[PDB]
Amino acid sequence: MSKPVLYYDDISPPVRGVLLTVAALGIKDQVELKLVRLFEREHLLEDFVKLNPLHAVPVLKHDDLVLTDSHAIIMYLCDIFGQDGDFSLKDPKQRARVHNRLCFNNAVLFQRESIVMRGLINRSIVTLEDHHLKPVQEAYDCLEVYLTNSKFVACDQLTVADFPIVACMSTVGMVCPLSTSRWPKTAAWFETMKQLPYYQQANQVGVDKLKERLHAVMK
Amino acid sequence: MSKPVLYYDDISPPVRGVLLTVAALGIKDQVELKLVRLFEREHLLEDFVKLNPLHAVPVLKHDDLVLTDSHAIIMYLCDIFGQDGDFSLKDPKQRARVHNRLCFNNAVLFQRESIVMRGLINRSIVTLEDHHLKPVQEAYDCLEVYLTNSKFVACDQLTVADFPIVACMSTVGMVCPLSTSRWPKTAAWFETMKQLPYYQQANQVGVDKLKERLHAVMK
Ligand SMILES: N[C@@H](CCC(=O)N[C@@H](CS)C(=O)NCC(=O)O)C(=O)O
Ligand SMILES: N[C@@H](CCC(=O)N[C@@H](CS)C(=O)NCC(=O)O)C(=O)O
Ligand SMILES: [Ca+2]
Ligand SMILES: [Ca+2]
Ligand SMILES: [Ca+2]
Ligand SMILES: [Ca+2]
Ligand SMILES: [Ca+2]
Ligand SMILES: [Ca+2]
């Protein structure tokens, strides 16, 4: 009927969490994309600020519904496209387990990694020291606990909560790489996620673009 | 049958978002409380760290389900206690609208206000300057847009998304008060929230405790 429109830039880990979800749900053909290029300041145009006063990506518009957080976009796409499949959130406890880990990404992992990555990119951080990376390492410690108790981040099956987290892990991993000695379950989970058939197009392309910008700033 | 247990300290805005939700849903007698006192470091005890490696409140345990983010706790309590009432999230678009504003609180308003409040309390900030408060004021600007387009934060009815946001607004308002000239819709919404019959017990008690600690540090 009516197709959701995803406003996006794939250098963003929040955006790539959604792109991974879209591919995993098999709904690439049901979700139209609209590029909003951050480095060219397209997120500050009047139309986009009216759509989202946070002037941030991703945004999903579906009819008159406007969602302005990747984690809300992901749960909504699950509800309307994934009810009868491997990513279903119909059961209340399963939905809460998944939402719990989405909150972990939004409020812990993404918050802490974004501080480091933005600071490096805007040159306010010119040398990474121990204090810069401790909050990220503490988030890795929590993730390692979760992946000791279940095979994937929210339960023993892959869920949509694995996607925002791997989008963040593949971003801050550029500056804070996983040690297999320190975080063995997280390192093995990360390698497993990288083997998903849609990982290259939905996540690695944007990671590669970010890595190029980081190398230039840091040289 | 089996009662959820809420691990809590009401000086915390995330906790008070849940306490407001519990009162609004009429389920105070269905949710057992377990005090975890932050100032006495009870959140660092081995049992609690095993329950939640983030060593933070609130936590909800319901049978074997352990939720470790106020926003996930609130949506879960809606699903299992509020399906047939004024706070229902059964409709997918309504659920997404509410979740969208929960994400705003968790990832924007709470993140920005907590930085300021924690910094004042640990004395790392000894004088509030313009740069300290600009991110909070930008969050107020977004809230004002939301409350121009709907009567409450997520739609024209009160929802559970109003509760985490008012818990934060009543905390950082101590140092960054709302101007009725700058944010008229937000100021009127805030006064309306303060008139809810459960606001005093569920939120003001904890705000009062925090205000006392702030005054002492800042004198
Ligand atoms: N919690 C939000 C975070 C969104 C966000 O911060 N997006 C960034 C890119 S990673 C952005 O568009 N920033 C633009 C700006 O800050 O002006 C989500 O998960 O969608
Ligand atoms: N996103 C979390 C935030 C929880 C949080 O940060 N709680 C604080 C109190 S406001 C805490 O318990 N901090 C203890 C610590 O940082 O060790 C939620 O909404 O539940
Ligand atoms: Ca198309
Ligand atoms: Ca161009
Ligand atoms: Ca225009
Ligand atoms: Ca009781
Ligand atoms: Ca005591
Ligand atoms: Ca013990």
Author numbering:
A (entry chain A), B (entry chain A): 1 to 219
Authors' account:
Here, we report that some flavonoids act as the inhibitors of the Ae. aegypti Noppera-bo (AeNobo) protein, which belongs to the glutathione S-transferase (GST) epsilon subfamily. Nobo plays a specialized role in the biosynthesis of the principal insect steroid hormones, ecdysteroids. As ecdysteroids are particularly important for the life cycle of insects, it is expected that a chemical inhibitor of ecdysteroidogenic enzymes, including Nobo, would be an insect growth regulator (IGR) that impacts insect development without affecting organisms other than insects. AeNobo adopts a canonical GST fold, which has a well-conserved GSH-binding site (G-site) and a hydrophobic substrate-binding pocket (H-site) adjacent to the G-site.
We prepared a purified AeNobo recombinant protein (220-aa length) using an Escherichia coli protein expression system. Using this system, we found that the specific enzymatic activity of AeNobo to conjugate glutathione (GSH) and 3,4-DNADCF was 2.04 ± 0.04 μmol·min−1·mg−1 in vitro, suggesting that AeNobo exhibits GST enzymatic activity. To reveal the molecular mechanism through which these flavonoids inhibit AeNobo enzymatic activity, we conducted an X-ray crystallographic analysis of AeNobo. Gel filtration chromatography revealed that AeNobo forms a homodimer in solutions, suggesting that its dimeric structure is a biological unit similar to DmNobo and other canonical GSTs. We found that the asymmetric unit of AeNobo is composed of four chains: A, B, C, and D. Each chain forms a biological dimer with a symmetry-related subunit by a crystallographic twofold axis. The subunit structures of AeNobo complex with inhibitors were essentially the same as those of the substrate-free form. Interactions between AeNobo and GSH in the G-site were essentially the same in the presence or absence of daidzein or luteolin, suggesting that these flavonoids do not interfere with the interaction between AeNobo and GSH.
